[PDB]
Amino acid sequence: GLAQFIKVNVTLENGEPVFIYTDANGQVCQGDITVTQAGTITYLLNDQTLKGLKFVGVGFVTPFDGIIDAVTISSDGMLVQLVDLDKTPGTTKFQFVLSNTANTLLVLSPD
Amino acid sequence: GLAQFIKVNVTLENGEPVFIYTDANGQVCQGDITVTQAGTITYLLNDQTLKGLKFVGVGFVTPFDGIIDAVTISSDGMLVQLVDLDKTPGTTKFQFVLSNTANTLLVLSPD
Amino acid sequence: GLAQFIKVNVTLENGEPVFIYTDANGQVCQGDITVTQAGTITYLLNDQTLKGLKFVGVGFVTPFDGIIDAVTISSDGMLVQLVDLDKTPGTTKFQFVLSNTANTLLVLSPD
Amino acid sequence: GLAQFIKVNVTLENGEPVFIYTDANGQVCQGDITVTQAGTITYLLNDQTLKGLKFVGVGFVTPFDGIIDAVTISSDGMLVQLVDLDKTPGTTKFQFVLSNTANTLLVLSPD
Amino acid sequence: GLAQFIKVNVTLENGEPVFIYTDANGQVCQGDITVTQAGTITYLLNDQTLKGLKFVGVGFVTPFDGIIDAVTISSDGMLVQLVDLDKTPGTTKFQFVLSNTANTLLVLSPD
Amino acid sequence: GLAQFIKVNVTLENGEPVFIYTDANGQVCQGDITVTQAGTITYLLNDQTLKGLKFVGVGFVTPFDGIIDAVTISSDGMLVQLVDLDKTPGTTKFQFVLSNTANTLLVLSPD
Amino acid sequence: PQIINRP
Amino acid sequence: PQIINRP
Amino acid sequence: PQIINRP
């Protein structure tokens, strides 16, 4: 399989989080992966908000669709990985889920 | 303040979760609270999916807007509460965040 | 229902914790709630001990009496809420349970 | 030092927990340790309540008195140990703190 | 990068765990990865011990050598991934670390 | 029983952890306990690495051998205890398992 | 503290 | 859902 | 983001 890597840069604009994805070549993208083989997608948190963001998981409105097989997370909340093991065809949408140190609300990336 | 209570009924349709909110009078609603005073909103999970859903928090795309001050959660994942302490005026949108026992993806209610 | 709010002020006297409850009007009280309808009681931690107190739950010597239906807690340990859903008549006594950063003993409010 | 062992038997009477301590010789006691040297006290949970009790810690109204230096707990909640490392003279009172599977209230042994 | 996948089959022989690694082609191997590019190694637990094994992490006697950059783990303990982000040259040895439901000892794969 | 106490001093040499055990008399030893009666062994972490080490458990390649009955751990990761309750005869080898704040790899003491 | 339920 | 604060 | 599986 292929191991893809995307950096999740989070800044604040007008006091609220903005998610900017950058790829291996440092280019801004939308952090979509059209996947053609079994593999992994690794998302690395670059928190520039001063709000103590940490990944707590990856959320799905259609979590049983089989497009993503599993989610793994590092102990420090700096990395999350999506595993696609069994190549279920189709498309799914997801939102990162993060804790923050300013309040007890979870943070979601846009739908 | 006022303590409001809403039941979060989760069923599966076509294999995927459907969120139906019911109010104190057992009526289906959209589980919105137009709030006029400081208080609490308590959401009670009624999981009818057989997928072992548990609340893990409440997520916000604009988590620093001050509309909701805090989130509390029960140890069994059956209840989450929103606290509105300081009456910040405006509107916010949120999505429930749940774990499940079928896979390691988090479940979100619709955006 | 009614949403009641009490601040749990913790100071140290002679090196040991003292719990002082204050109500909405900033008055010292004993942080008892005679409750007449279904609702919530929200306790807000104001830790002035320098011992890193955080709520970890609410403890009961008679936990199956039905007077309190559920306990919820915020992720930062700054809030705990008691839920009284089904109006079981009677009286119960409880003690706050807190972790601290000085040692690995849990802290209890007086019996 | 001395390693002492006490079994914490929990039964239900009139629907509520009763704590009965038994010593090495299977005798009922009050599970007090007058301690004369540095050592450990190990408490083993024998839950006969059907309420899924697990230790979550040991609580103290005077947690900074130095009589007990540390508390350790097993991953399954079946054991807690008190460590007395530095022989601070005096007396302290404590209450076991337990989770249960029937509700989200913590269980305390009597004050 | 390359995404490699190895199944960690755990059986019991003479009452104790035996770790057998199988590769993509279902062949037994030693579950070593000579790595030539940045990527991921995903380990999938197949627990055949009846002892309720779950991954809790991956342990290293030389954890600061930079050969492996990060470890991620799934919420159910069924997957762990090693991330090699920055291609530090050299060799490292590791042991899987697992919890079990029979006792409170952690399980290690052989050194 | 006997309560034995050993200090686990961790330093760094050539960037990697070194475990030095000291006994009650401040002597360096190998932190082995030949045990002749039921009791406890308490290990106290003295982390001099600046890498934020905390115990997370004690690991065994032969975890079902019965030599050690249980492991307990303090909430701050500064203490772990081995319990030997039922005097199973024989010998076992173990490795401390620690988290660190520099990376997400677990730290093991030598095999 | 104490809670008194008077439904 | 949505929450509307009208203090 | 979105993921598109084209096996």
Added chain:
Amino acid sequence: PQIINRP
């Protein structure tokens, strides 16, 4: 219970 330390 109670613990009494008599060093």
Added chain:
Amino acid sequence: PQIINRP
């Protein structure tokens, strides 16, 4: 380390 049980 190693533990040796000699009951």
Added chain:
Amino acid sequence: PQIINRP
């Protein structure tokens, strides 16, 4: 197991 990095 062992990992060998040959960049």
